[PDB]
Task: structure prediction
Amino acid sequence: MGPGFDFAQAIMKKNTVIARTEKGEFTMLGVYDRVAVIPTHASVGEIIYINDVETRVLDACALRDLTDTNLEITIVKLDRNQKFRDIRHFLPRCEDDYNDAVLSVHTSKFPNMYIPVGQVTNYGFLNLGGTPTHRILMYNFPTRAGQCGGVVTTTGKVIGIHVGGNGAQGFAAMLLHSYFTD
Result:
C-alpha cells in the first residue's frame, strides 16, 4: 500500500524461505551467503526442511547476551546450493525504538501476509514462555500462532523477528549488525 510495505515486500520476495522443524513451519529470514535466522523455540536439529527440501544444517547457534541471558535468535548455516542476497547493511547497529513498522509472514497457512503494527518499543526484559529474554521489541497488535519468525521492518531497516505475543501485544527479538560480522 505505501513505502513501508514496499521495503517489506522486497525483503520477503528475495530473503525468506519456509523452514519446517519438528516444532512446525516458520518464516525464516536469510541474511547473507547460506546464513539465516529463526526463533530458538523452533528447536533446529541436524536436518531441516527449506521450501519442502530436506537440508543439512552445517551449524546452528542459539544466541545469548554477555549476561548469559536468552536472546531467542538461532543463527543457522544451511547446506543449500544458493546464496541469499546480502542484506546485512539493512540491520541496525544499536538497540532502538522505531515508528511505523510492518510484520511480514510467509508460510503454507499465511502466504503473502503483511501487518502494519505501528510504533515499536525497545521493551528489553521479557519472561517469554517462562524464559528470561533480553533485547525484546514490543508492538501493540494481537499477533497469533503461525506468525513466529515473521520479519519486522521499517523503510530501509530489518529490525527483528517475531517470537511471541500475549493476545494484545507482540514481541520480536532484535536483529543487530554485530550478530552477522564474518
